[PDB]
Structure 1
Amino acid sequence: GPKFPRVKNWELGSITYDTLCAQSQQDGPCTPRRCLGSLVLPRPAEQLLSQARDFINQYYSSIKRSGSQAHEERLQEVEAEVASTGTYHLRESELVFGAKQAWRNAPRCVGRIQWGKLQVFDARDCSSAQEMFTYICNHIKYATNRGNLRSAITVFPQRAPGRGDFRIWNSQLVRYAGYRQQDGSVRGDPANVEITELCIQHGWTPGNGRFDVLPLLLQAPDEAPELFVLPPELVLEVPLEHPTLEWFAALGLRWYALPAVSNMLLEIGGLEFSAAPFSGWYMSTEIGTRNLCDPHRYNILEDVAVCMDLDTRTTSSLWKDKAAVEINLAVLHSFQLAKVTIVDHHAATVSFMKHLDNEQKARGGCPADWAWIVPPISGSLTPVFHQEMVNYILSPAFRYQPDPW
């Protein structure tokens, strides 16, 4: 057969060959001696220029003018810019294309059926932390759209030789505080203990609840970060109730509506956008299984299981699994009632299967990280469990970047 990875689906018995993987330049963490697929994060004029040429070529293909005079004029303008300034700048439509392409390229994202629908706010004129805040508020208002969520990214100025970076210090735009107690336990979200304490060092007055929304810490070039409080009314939340277990509402659980990732770097054509927050909508398992049930997060499984009167003394009762299911249903049910967009892990995975097919035909493959794409409950009940996947890095890309502090 073909000299490209053979990819098999064991539910349906179908085979494809990924040819797109040939376009990867960036090495991942695996070698023939050993596989590092399950690690979460394993560890220049002509270099820029060659990434930029590639990216310009990708742009020109996407609008089908590849080889054209407009294409070769653009290449020359990019090399002239780099020639004299060490960097270059994207046209507005190049930024839009490349922000969508970074999403399309993200191997860990099961939401990619939607990749073509992204509102790109171009905030590359922003020159202060105060203005970042206005741009972020606008982003939140647009994206939240009273519950009918709309995917969006706001792109602040690119990294620039010897000026400091734009950075949003928080990992998401909405995060609940995590307060380290005297006994060493945590009130609120343990994932956010460090950002929480950073907010306090920078002058935030802390509350003492389990669902306290954090302020944002925004950093403009060569300045100390500054602290901004989201107006409450911009932060849509859904209190959690269960469709038949009446007591579930009494637990006083809630989640925010808008997942908006704020600490990743968007790389396009070798240019680096260090502040570039993006939002879509939640898959229900992110809230109901990971955020509420991870032992190192809210850790609520036992409390729910006790309310359900389950046998928590023995694993073989499947207490954990029954409680998790009900917690997931409550999340789906509560978001539905509140009219806030959300997708269940069955509907999400089916649509990702459809994405896979569309990409097979459009590009000859799709990079995907099976461990992240298969949901954290009910794995083999989703079609993605049964689908082999090839993981590789393409650019444009969203990448992790070191914390600013």
Structure 2
Amino acid sequence: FPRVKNWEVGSITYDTLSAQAQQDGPCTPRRCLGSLVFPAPEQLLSQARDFINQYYSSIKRSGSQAHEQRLQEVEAEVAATGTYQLRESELVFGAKQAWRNAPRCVGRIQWGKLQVFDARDCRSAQEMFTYICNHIKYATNRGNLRSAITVFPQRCPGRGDFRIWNSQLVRYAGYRQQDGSVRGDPANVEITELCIQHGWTPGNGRFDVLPLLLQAPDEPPELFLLPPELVLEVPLEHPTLEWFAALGLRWYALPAVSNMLLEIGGLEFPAAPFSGWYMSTEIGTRNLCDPHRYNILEDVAVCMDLDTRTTSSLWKDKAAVEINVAVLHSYQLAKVTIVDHHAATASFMKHLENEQKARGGCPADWAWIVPPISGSLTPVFHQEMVNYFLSPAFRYQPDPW
């Protein structure tokens, strides 16, 4: 059992939960690949068995009446149909566990508070769009955001998958410019080109909300525009740099990842978008300051009258800090939920202690948990972590085009 030290305090724990790691990661004794972004009924049966055991553990009913019945029921259904169906309560438990198990998520202190929308009856792309609009409306909640996931029908033989082609429900377009540059968000150039290819009339702003490409089984994707009043946005201003408003920057309230696969007990849900609320560094540091994103850092530093000709003035650090200040200030001003990296990392430390007592460990990806500014100022920097894969899980999947 790996020993895990906290260097700020001297605390030591052992991660016995990693021993239960089923699926394997990319590291070996030869070489660590931890920093890489992207690392048969009988095997269906073992994953289902393990999940049913997890569920009956959670309802304090392991080895009971209901428990063995469900095990036999699932087996019989796998033998008879090649697959099986989750009960509603098992689905809710599985979606929360998938969040709880996600090693790159710093917000997991919230894992138990997740609104699960059961869309497993969804029949079409048009119904899919309706469900998604209701997810966005519920989750946004006029700025008082609520964690939620909508679960569309599982993958099954004989039918194609439900897929949301967009990587998030709200994304800004990225238009390859006249002179080779990108207007808008360069992360979204491909999906922008897919929307235009599918009949979307593009805009030419920097913050144009993209339409949804929604794929029903064995159907080409269909284009659906989000009603503007559903997509809550926050104009960015700075509490003391009044010229900051003139940059014309905005961001959207609702982070809703829509391209990941949800796995529960061997069943796969290729379409199960989930949403929380932002941590300010995601917007202020990554989305706005990455050289390959909006890349505003030099423009801000220049307007701040910093000396950008030498790196040792720390003009980059100073401009990034104020961009994060602006993000927090603007979201608070707009009354839209947001958490800063200090509050977020501190609550993740409480999560780790909770999980050590609950399960004997917690899978965590240090490189993703530690925030992208002010790393060692947060408590998670000084916390060793063990990364491993537990199921139920959220997993990357290939793009459907």
Mapped partners of 1:149, 1:263: distance in 2: 21
Mapped partners of 2:248, 2:210: distance in 1: 19
Shift of 1:151: 0.2
Task: Give per-residue Cα distances to partners, 1:212-269, cap 9 Å, x unaligned.
Answer: 0000000000001100000000000000000111110111111000000000000000
Shift of 1:37: 0.7
Counterpart for residue 6 of structure 2: 9
Helix, strand or coil for the counterpart of 2:339?
coil
Mapped partners of 1:315, 1:37: distance in 2: 30
Mapped partners of 2:19, 2:94: distance in 1: 19
Counterpart for residue 33 of structure 2: 36
Helix, strand or coil for the counterpart of 2:326?
helix
Could you tell me which runs of 5 or more consecutive residues in structure 2 were left unpaired when the two chains were aligned.
none
1:216 aligns with 2:218: no
Task: Give per-residue Cα distances to partners, 1:73-101, cap 9 Å, x unaligned.
Answer: 00011011001100000000000000000
Mapped partners of 2:281, 2:252: distance in 1: 14
Cα gap change, 1:383/1:176 in structure 2, threshold over 3 Å: closer, same or farther? same
Task: Give per-residue Cα distances to partners, 1:340-369, cap 9 Å, x unaligned.
Answer: 000000000000000000000000000000
Shift of 1:162: 2.1
Task: Give per-residue Cα distances to partners, 1:102-130, cap 9 Å, x unaligned.
Answer: 00000000000000000000000001000
Shift of 1:183: 1.6
Mapped partners of 1:321, 1:190: distance in 2: 23
Mapped partners of 1:62, 1:329: distance in 2: 41
Counterpart for residue 23 of structure 1: 20
Mapped partners of 1:189, 1:287: distance in 2: 12
Mapped partners of 1:7, 1:71: distance in 2: 35
Helix, strand or coil for the counterpart of 1:121?
strand
Mapped partners of 2:310, 2:157: distance in 1: 59
Cα gap change, 1:43/1:54 in structure 2, threshold over 3 Å: closer, same or farther? closer
Mapped partners of 1:161, 1:23: distance in 2: 30
Mapped partners of 1:140, 1:180: distance in 2: 28
Helix, strand or coil for the counterpart of 1:299?
coil
Shift of 1:69: 1.4
Task: Give per-residue Cα distances to partners, 1:132-173, cap 9 Å, x unaligned.
Answer: 000000000000000000000000000011200000000000
TM-score scaled to structure 1, two decimals? 0.98
Mapped partners of 1:33, 1:172: distance in 2: 36
Mapped partners of 1:27, 1:280: distance in 2: 28
Alignment of 1:54-203 (within 5 A): 54-203=50-199
Shift of 1:181: 1.1
Mapped partners of 1:134, 1:172: distance in 2: 16
Task: Give per-residue Cα distances to partners, 1:284-330, cap 9 Å, x unaligned.
Answer: 00000000000000000000001001111110110100000000000
Shift of 1:42: 2.2
Alignment of 1:247-258 (within 5 A): 247-258=243-254
Mapped partners of 1:168, 1:32: distance in 2: 38
Task: Give per-residue Cα distances to partners, 1:159-217, cap 9 Å, x unaligned.
Answer: 01120000000000000000001221100000000000000000000000000000000
Helix, strand or coil for the counterpart of 1:272?
strand
Helix, strand or coil for the counterpart of 2:31?
coil
Mapped partners of 1:290, 1:25: distance in 2: 32
Shift of 1:64: 1.0
**Aligned residues: CA RMSD:** 1.2
Shift of 1:43: 21
Could you tell me which runs of 5 or more consecutive residues in structure 1 were left unpaired when the two chains were aligned.
none
Alignment of 1:273-312 (within 5 A): 273-312=269-308
Cα gap change, 1:339/1:43 in structure 2, threshold over 3 Å: closer, same or farther? farther
1:335 aligns with 2:331: yes
Matched residue pairs, number? 401
Mapped partners of 1:30, 1:402: distance in 2: 21
Question: Which consecutive segments of 4 or more residues in structure 1 shift more than 3 A?
Answer: none
Shift of 1:279: 0.3
Mapped partners of 2:2, 2:359: distance in 1: 14
1:232 aligns with 2:224: no
Mapped partners of 2:346, 2:314: distance in 1: 27
1:374 aligns with 2:386: no
Helix, strand or coil for the counterpart of 1:48?
helix
